[model samples]
Target: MLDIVLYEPEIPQNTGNIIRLCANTGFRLHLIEPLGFTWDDKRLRRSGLDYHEFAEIKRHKTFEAFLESEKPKRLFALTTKGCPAHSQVKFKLGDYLMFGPETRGIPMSILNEMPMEQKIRIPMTANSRSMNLSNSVAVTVYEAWRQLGYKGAVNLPEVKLPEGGS
Candidate 1:
């Protein structure tokens, strides 16, 4: 129900993992252009394989293009430089979660355009730099999903152990 945008992502593996994550979580994935790797990258295929077909993915030629097309009502830019921990935000359906490139993160120029409240960060130690792209996405997505009561998620059947088991 939420949208995950990766801005100029640099690694194939991370994107691959995120594709699987989105597939299972029911989040739509958006990729901005000038990507570091081609769509046919074997590493991406290897990581995303069985789940790729299940994911809903879209590509934008540029960030501007994405904005024009999606026109997200509420866009949250995920960055270490941002204020307020991600958990502080009350995410709702159709909210856009935008992540930056692995090494550079989002450019200050673009971030400056967003309101301070729209920028959210994951809490970490003072000495730490940042978390892995896919991991960060997973954490933020799940938190948002939790707030929304995990709509559309399926519950597994209950199982009971043998009464006499040690």
Candidate 2:
């Protein structure tokens, strides 16, 4: 299984789209606390639609606490702060792919707290500030999944549904 963690995400619609992303991809989504929006917000719910029902999201109280989660082996912080191409990371089973806020990314303290090699950045044109949160997550997650052969229910042998009754 893949793990996606967000650090103090500032936009609900982005988070909602990510929720749907996790639901559809069968990944475990983690939201580190100090969130800017609530799950019940109309914009969030509306954007998420019925996807929330399938989303396996967990809210954490702190970043340190989130880091301690048993979800994934190593936390790969995605930020523009440091370098080491994303694809260069030797990914393992159940790796944690983390991203920060839309505007500021993670705190300097947190980003600088770890080795510069611990963080990664997506390839971008010169002078590009950033990519949308949800888009970045989708790209990274799918690339990782594709590397792992996309093993999941969707890739599993077809199962026959029962005769129609609805």
Candidate 3:
């Protein structure tokens, strides 16, 4: 199972969107401390819609605490400054995908501490500074899941027959 870790996310809509992503993809969510908005904020709920019920969300006191307890084998931090485009990694099951706040990315101290090879980035035009947090998460999640052959995911949609139909 993949894990989505958001470090001090500042926007409700972005976090909300990611919550739905987690629900859809079956990835667990980890929220680091000092969130900009309350988890109960209306914007967050509005963006996430009704997906919260299905999402496996967890809260952490801080990033360090999360690292200590989860002890993920491979933790990939996504940042504009990261190398080896996100697609380059051969993501395996149980890996953790970590993202930073929208305004400011993962703290430099943490980035410096993480192995250089563990940091991943999504390529963009030179003029663009970054992508939306939710969009970034979507891109990263899909790529990682693709690498794993989308294991355990259903492909077909369920059919709903009319009430009178056999």
TM-score of each: 0.88, 0.83, 0.86
lDDT of each: 0.83, 0.76, 0.81
Task: Tell me how far the alpha carbon of residue 50 in candidate 3 is from the true structure, in angstroms, after superposition.
Answer: 4.9
Against the correct fold, how does model 2 do in TM-score?
0.83
Q: Tens digits of per-residue lDDT for model 3 on 94-145?
A: 6998999998879899999888788998998868767899999999998887
Q: For residues 1-166, write the lDDT of model 2, one tens digit per residue.
A: 5788888989888887887777677777888888888756777777636644624468889987876766456778898877887777766776888899888778888777777876988888978767899998988877776677565645566657521000
Stretch of 10 with least lDDT, candidate 2 = 157-166
Scored by TM-score, the top model is 1
Judged by lDDT against the true structure, how good is candidate 2? 0.76
* Per-residue lDDT of model 1, residues 1-166, tens digit only: 7899999999988888888788777888899888898757777666636544623469899899999999998999997778889999988776999999999979998999998998999998879867899899999988988887666666634435321000
Ranking by lDDT: 1, 3, 2
lDDT score for residue 79 of model 2? 82
